[PDB]
Amino acid sequence: PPGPPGPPGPKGDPGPPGPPGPPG
Amino acid sequence: PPGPPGPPGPKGDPGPPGPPGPPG
Amino acid sequence: PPGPPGPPGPKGDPGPPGPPGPPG
């Protein structure tokens, strides 16, 4: 029989920078 | 006999966008 | 003989939240 599925892959990168702060 | 575990899975998605920046 | 290697593992988890955006 084929072996078990391998381990979970590496977690993704940190997400994009957030939006600019609100306008004064 | 059973085969060995498969390779590591693919890489994950980028994380969520970050928070809005500080007020000016 | 031992069977074929298993499939690739699950896709990795999403990364963490990104950093704060620029000052408003």
Side-chain angles (χ1 to χ4, degrees):
Chain A
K11 56 200 144 99
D13 304 319
Chain B
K11 188 165 280 201
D13 298 344
Chain C
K11 190 195 213 289
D13 300 337

